[PDB]
């Protein structure tokens, strides 16, 4: 079909501030269903994000109108920009405006990735009857849990500094008349992006002259609020998701920074409305399926046309009343790593998931990959413990995983470069003779003790290949002061043994014959997470010099059954 495009149509918000939108309307008679996208990266720049989403022009050619809007305070829109705080109201007023237009038939939907996904959850809680469906990709409904902090209570510092530098560069390269400093700033912002770990290594972390100037929010909201307090609660949508009845087509990536939260949104809305889930082996910046030491095959490449077809079927069902539009479409579609194949599922978590404990054990010290650390479904008979020194000045480098900006294009990273570290404990199963599928949420329960009043403990699931590659799958961290709650932290007593849980997000991997299941335990993973100072103080306000090293210990045996819980699937 044919269509037209109207640029910079100004939409008034409740406070009088006008946001700019571009209207892609089909050349048809009568009102049509409409799809909305709220974008902070310039509505004009469609190529920048569309390749990670859908060939949505197909929607317009098929009769849908598409509205792309500049969020408040950015590019063509008026007002002041502050992340997240105005999106709920602005989305509500925008949806109301769309519903009032002559070309809207009363059915509105949304789609988009990341920030363009978070804004959909913020729109969904408005209660606007006209919003019939959303499709949040690689998104979150709880900004503290993803992407700024996490279930463990540690700051995702590389995510914060990287995104902030990107926003800053955008704020500058768009100004209404360049400034004298602009040139210099753009240089500094680039220096941050080329070495995020370096930018995150400065102490006190809270001191950000550049970023703090270009976007105060970086410190005023994120850095200054390490507890999941009221400031975070205010923009979290998660608790309100259970009361909604809005269909949601959710997409996630196993190595994507928002994966944990993306999956949780599916679980939160699947009972009250038509929810769909698609999870590929992608990281935020790498949807190719190709990584430095791991290739998932061409079938793993983000299937943009298939995604477009699925989104159209989803919108046809919920916005155009086509009751059989989703016939044959699975509820859940996962890329199962190892066998490296897409597979349909009827639900997530998968039905028949056997949450199986794999206990830490072994003779001697489990320090380093050449230690004697073992993993077994049987409880260890010997009461032992592995000890190591965690020094904030020398944290374990982040390698792959869900990194967003700091080397965030190699999720399934080979871990061998850090296997020689004494602060990296390794526990592996024997070489497998039969495949073992692990698909679902993953967590660990460790009995630990520290010489400090606070510290961190990390756990990483790894697939060890016959050729030696130790490929990262999923990982988590627990900042001890938040061991029981992210809201009201309390310190620990040196030497006392605590049983703590580490949320390791999720994965889908078949450990094939010849492989080993391995878990890496430590007390740091920088800059994925900022370093714990081991002092019990305000971490972001401490000087490296005033920080302490900590002698940490992992207890294992009959009385302290430390283990990782794997979601075993047997078919």
Swiss-Prot record:
Outcome when changing residue 284 to A: Loss of activity
Region described as 1B: spans on this chain: 238-351
Further comment found in the protein's record: This enzyme hydrolyzes cocaine faster than any other known cocaine esterase.
Keyword set, alphabetical order: Cytoplasm, Hydrolase, Serine esterase
pH-dependence of activity, as noted: Optimum pH is 9.0.
Active site residues according to the UniProt entry: 114, 256, 284
Phenotypic consequence of residue 52 to A/E: Decrease in activity
Region 2, residue ranges: 142-237
Protein name: Cocaine esterase
UniProt-reported outcome of changing residue 404 to A: Decrease in activity
Cellular component, GO annotation: cytoplasm
UniProt keyword Coiled coil present: no
């Amino acid at each position: 079909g044919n269509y037209s495009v109207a640029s910079n149509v100004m939409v008034p918000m409740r406070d009088g501030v006008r946001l700019a939108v571009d209207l892609y309307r089909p050349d048809a008679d009568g009102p049509v269903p409409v799809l909305l996208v709220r974008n902070p990266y310039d509505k004009f720049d469609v190529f920048a994000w569309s390749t990670q989403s859908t060939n949505w022009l197909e929607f317009v050619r098929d009769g849908y109108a598409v509205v792309i809007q500049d969020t408040r305070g950015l590019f063509a829109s008026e007002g002041e920009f502050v992340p997240h705080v105005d999106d709920e109201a602005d989305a509500e007023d925008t949806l109301s405006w769309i519903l009032e237009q002559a070309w809207c038939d009363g059915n509105v939907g949304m789609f988009g990735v990341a920030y363009l996904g978070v804004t959909q959850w913020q729109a969904a809680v408005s209660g606007v009857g006209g919003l019939k469906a959303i499709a949040p990709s690689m998104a979150s409904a709880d900004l503290y849990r993803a992407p700024w902090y996490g279930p463990g209570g540690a700051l995702s510092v590389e995510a914060l500094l990287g995104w902030s530098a990107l926003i800053g560069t955008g704020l500058i390269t768009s100004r209404s008349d360049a400034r004298p400093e602009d040139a210099a700033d753009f240089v500094q912002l680039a220096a941050i992006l080329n070495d995020v770990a370096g930018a995150a290594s400065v102490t006190p972390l809270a001191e950000q002259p550049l970023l703090g100037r270009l976007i105060p929010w970086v410190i005023d909201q994120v850095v200054d609020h390490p507890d999941n307090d009221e400031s975070w609660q205010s923009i979290s949508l998660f608790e309100r998701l259970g009361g909604l009845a809005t269909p949601a087509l959710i997409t996630a990536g196993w190595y994507d920074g928002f994966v944990g939260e993306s999956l949780r949104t599916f679980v939160a809305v699947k009972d009250n409305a038509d929810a769909r889930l698609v999870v590929g082996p992608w990281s935020h910046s790498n949807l190719t399926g190709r990584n430095a030491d791991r290739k998932f095959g061409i079938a793993a490449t983000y299937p943009i046309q298939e995604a477009t077809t699925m989104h159209k079927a989803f919108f046809d069902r919920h916005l155009r009343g086509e009751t059989d539009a989703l016939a044959g479409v699975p509820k859940v579609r996962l890329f199962v790593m190892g066998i490296d194949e897409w597979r349909d599922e009827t639900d997530w978590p998968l039905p028949d998931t056997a949450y199986t404990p794999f206990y830490l054990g072994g003779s001697g010290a489990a320090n380093t990959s050449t230690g004697g650390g073992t993993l077994s479904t049987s409880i260890s008979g010997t009461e032992s413990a592995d000890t190591y020194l965690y020094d904030p000045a020398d944290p374990v480098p982040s390698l792959g995983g869900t990194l967003l900006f700091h080397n965030g294009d190699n999720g399934p990273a080979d871990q061998r470069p850090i296997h020689d570290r004494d602060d990296v404990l390794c526990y592996s199963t024997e070489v497998l003779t039969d495949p073992v599928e692990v698909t679902g949420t993953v967590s660990a329960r460790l009995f630990v003790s520290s010489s400090a009043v606070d510290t961190d403990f990390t756990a990483k699931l790894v697939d060890v290949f016959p050729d030696g590659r130790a490929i990262a799958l999923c990982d988590g961290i627990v900042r001890m002061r938040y061991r029981e709650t992210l809201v009201n932290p309390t310190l620990i007593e040196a030497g006392e043994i605590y049983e703590v849980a580490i949320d390791m997000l999720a994965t889908s991997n078949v450990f094939l014959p010849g492989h080993r299941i391995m878990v890496q335990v430590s007390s740091s993973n920088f800059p994925k997470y900022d370093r714990n100072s081991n002092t019990g103080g305000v971490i972001a306000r401490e000087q490296l010099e005033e920080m302490c090293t900590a002698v940490n210990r992992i207890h294992r045996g009959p009385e302290h059954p430390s283990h990782i819980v794997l979601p075993i699937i047997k078919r």
